[model samples]
Target: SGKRGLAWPWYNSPLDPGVLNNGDGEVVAIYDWETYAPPTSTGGTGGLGFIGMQGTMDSDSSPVAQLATRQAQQGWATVFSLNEPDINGITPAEAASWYIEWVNPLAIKKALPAVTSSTTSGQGLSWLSEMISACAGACYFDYINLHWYGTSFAEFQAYIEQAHNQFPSYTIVISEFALTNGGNQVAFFESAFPFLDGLSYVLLYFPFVATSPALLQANDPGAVTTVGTGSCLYTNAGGPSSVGNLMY
Candidate 1:
């Protein structure tokens, strides 16, 4: 089994240090889902591992060369590549080429692109499978990254299980997950936390957000409008939200 942590723009504001060390020992890693440096409070004396992500939204920001250089200097434990490529218009063959040329050279652990839970043809798990096939043993990776948005712990559990069944050999990293429309987030995590912890195939899981509802709304208006505020991990005052309390 792996550990749990937060996923958000930690650089935007520091999370309450209390919530990071609330005695559950679950918050072992933190990530921003970008290639930038992590906040100082995240690693080293802060006692958390920082993971990096390459590319965002629909395409890469910098050239692969720059991303590789940044990762070499920043030296994170693991790296995630391409956010939602399955729906972002990135083909499996193109991703495989990019992965082999850039991401494969990293000495640290690597994860494939984060895919959605969509069951549409050439998407989700099927998209990942095609990418793996395109790699043809050229791309090097350790984990299969995933993102989920839905209500109900049972659906979440089934989705994760299906991912494992689809990619039995690779470990799993849930980079982003939450209930759509913010339906009963606290109740969702109350069940999700323990269920994920028990799965040996799961190496790490990041709840959909780490910022307060207000901040999240301010920074990502589109996401807030789409998912609503119930899943936010912090309150307006910057303390942990009800769902965040479950992290510890």
Candidate 2:
């Protein structure tokens, strides 16, 4: 518990949509090398990395593709989600290969997004580059997602900045980001949630979603007025050190 965990990340099952959809949420599972491996290969690297063992055979088996078809049939919009495909265990070399084979093809066909680990190929920069190159022109993805834990605000900010610089066109989302460790972590998290809520409110102060009276306006309408003071949504919520934080 006191030591740093796995340096690499792994995916076991095609991503379970529980984290993303929280139920009734659509998830696209990609068949990765590790997914096919026996359960022994699926584990966190000393708790530092995340591992899984699930695979997506083809477009027919992909949840994203399925969701697309469903949208056409049901006439209801649905969100698409995918896991960072790391079938070859939690190593850089394997990640590189997975990017080429699984991730690239999925993007070209489905345009789904992924939340990849920063340590792919032993370097965050390389992982990001590989993703862009492989999926470029494939028209896959909306934003690049990343997970960060046991890190400081400065480190997280740096990662976000670099991601912005590298892929300015694509938006970025912090999927499983949180701070952990330390004995007083819960107390810290309790106090921090409110602060985070405040920041989230400030982000909403921008006039993008409010101006459009139309429920489904697709085009950019430029400016809109900030509605109300953002409410504090995280009151009493424990901070990042909580074990549940990682699982969610």
Candidate 3:
């Protein structure tokens, strides 16, 4: 399992999530953007632990009203609330209120809303800070969720360093991360995987995605323009790419 999980979407159905669990194990957990069962996997790790998400404000498929019940039924230990609400036009106070109402009741681990790594005030971590302030110390949580996209590994590392410095007390979970607008994803992950693994404060991280190149091109061609196929964990023929092998 290490500190790596899948940043999966409902559309990423072509690539088998089980490939990572081949006997020895590569990835140990899974999460889709909704509160459904983890997709089936046939090999190692017994069963992959699923982390549920209360993905959006009012998604019919993943509505907030069912969040607590779904989590209770599924028994997943962690529930991540909101997906990029910071950039998705949600206000900090609004998120704070919602989180307190629904998320605070979860007895399991809880991660704050995932935020972009924007440096602008009232955005990114600043947004999270505001949400916490609005919480007035009543919000109960375990991890600081983050998403990062940058031009180089140096900047990526620096961003992690800066975020750690910002809130040294809490551990970090980088649910999404990669170079922005196309760089060397293979090279980047080579360094990134170990960097995150070695950090005692980093509890988890998912590469930008795990879809095969063909699937990505067909389903999310925009991602190809942003990060290329080097980061694709699977080849077109449904086997591990060089980067995917690194998961072992």
Candidate 4:
């Protein structure tokens, strides 16, 4: 049932999140990599549950107390930790300490800091491994969060398999993923949806985004240059895109 989710950020707040969970859609979860002002579904939640992410490295957003308050109020079942700390300025040791202090107390399922696909010595999986080592057996978590983007389904599949091989014991949460700019995202998701759904260890998989093409272009042009608009779940008119239909 790990079909799809939303990596929806702040700019996506204007749209109705309820649309994705409207009876026929396969979207069952959403997250904004934030802890405040979660976009509410106009109708009922419609089965789309929000997962709280404690990823902001700076103190500006989601201090531990704020994240904890939201978790208490929303009762999110899973928590996603640091956002791409490997490539960001955060060092593995610092992240481990931060994870221990902030993410450990959550009673629900927990995912380690979402890492990039970079294979650099102190980044990506390597950085994650170092952080785990630094935890010294104190960090409590259950999922390996990953963010990936590539040109083909084959490469995507290979990267996921590699992550599984390295951390076979932990469940995985692909918090963000998509084909690079100009690739066939429809075909990519068609292959990826069933492939990930079949994997017992994969708990949740969110495409890189959930927004209209124009909104994305206006809000985050950097994403347009990288992941492109092919995977955007919504159209500019605030409805589903061609790729969005596959959510069903």
Candidate 5:
């Protein structure tokens, strides 16, 4: 079984390690979707593994080349690449060349670009297949990253299984997943956590968010508007939400 972690944001305060360890269970890692030093404490000893992500090629976001250099200097155990290139319009050929040049040299665990669950052309599994083909065995990667959002546990399960079937040789890392349009996220995680924990192929999974409802609403208006605050792991006053209570 893989470890549980929080997919936090750079803007929010660090998650209470005491709550994450004592209440939610053991949080083995924390990711803010971009490069930054790991927090010194999370209410637990020895600290949590901090993972870095090269989220985009944009100048404002951490550049892919710079992030790769930072990961090598920081000596993180793993590095995630290209947040969601398929949906972001980065072509397979472009990503392949970039990945081989920058990401492959990290000399650590690497995850392919995270892709959406959409079945549309050049969006989901098909897009990943194209990237793999383009790599032609040149891209060095340890895991295939995924991001999924929908209404049902059945749909989530089917998507996970399908991804494994599509790339059976690689381990899977689900960096983000949650119900859309304010679906019953609490119930969804009740089933999702156990199912994911039981899978041998799943190396890590982060629920959609790990920020307070108020902070999320204040900082990321677009996400709050689209994904809603129902799945937030913290309350405005900084306590575990219903879904956060299940992390253990």
Candidate 6:
């Protein structure tokens, strides 16, 4: 199949490593520890700069420990979390304990090989700090990542503030953020963007903004805002109609 499929408008596809030369390329690849564990790619131009893992590294699974050994050997710059202690399936307290027992210890031990010589030991942490501290801070990951969606601004803001103050050393990244557009999404984004931007710009200049523009427009704003030849917002909605009013 000569299908390019979804072209990543930003980074190079994982199938080709040439575009990533000179330490400038960024690729978000998922390596499943369960089925096929990837040998660290020597194709990384100046060594892979950022490598983040997902559910591929389950806590109860041994693949995590094995992958950690390989990552350390490759001297990979960063390792995002691989802990997937389901929050809904298990109690938060129990899940936290599981993290301490399995995730943090292995990551800390593995990161040593990469950190010993490099100035920066890149290890972005998953949102499981409760577990890390419980294990005597065995895993000192580079960043703390979390996910948020369909939540109120106040609620999310409180979460961020707590993480910022509690773990002042680690960087914060919202691994995922979304809205259901349940109520006034257009109003929400319009109001939310400035505040969110302000918070990010002021708080250590963290870039924490991402949106599915077309999807959000379809749901929230209900229409795309295109610039016309005459420099005005253009839309496919029939001009001066009730549907247009609802869309605008």
lDDT of 5 by residue, 33-92 (tens): 787654423433225577888877545657654776678677789988888899887998
Q: Write the candidate numbers in order of decreasing lDDT.
A: 4, 3, 5, 1, 6, 2
Candidate 4 vs. true structure, TM-score:
0.94
Query: Residue 105, candidate 1: how far off, in angstroms?
Result: 0.6
Q: Of the pair 4 and 6, which is ahead by TM-score?
A: 4
TM-score of 1: 0.91
Question: Candidates' TM-scores?
Answer: 0.91, 0.40, 0.93, 0.94, 0.91, 0.42
Model 5 earns a TM-score of 0.91
Of 2 and 3, the candidate ahead on lDDT is 3
lDDT of 3 at 89: 88
Q: Candidate 1's residue-wise lDDT over 108-182, tens digit each? A: 999999999999988999999999999999998999999999877899999998888877878999999988884
Top of the candidates by lDDT: 4
Ranking by TM-score: 4, 3, 5, 1, 6, 2
Clashes of 4: 0
**Which digits, one per residue and each the tens of the lDDT, describe model 3 over residues 1-248?**
47777766666655577676666645777787788764433322225678999878668888788888898898888989898888888999999998999889999999999999888888999999999899999899999999998888899899999999989998899888878765777889999988888899998888877667787888888888877777777788767788778776
> Residue 167 in model 1: shift from native, Å?
1.5
lDDT tens digits, residue span 139-234, model 4:
999988999988889998899899999989888899999998888999999999999988898888998788889989998999999888999998
Please tell me which model should have the higher TM-score, number 2 or number 4: 4
* Pairs in steric clash, model 4: none
Model 5: worst 10 consecutive residues (lDDT sum): 38-47
Tens-digit per-residue lDDT, 139-230, candidate 2: 34444544444435555456555666766665544433444333243443344334333432111010001111221122222211211111
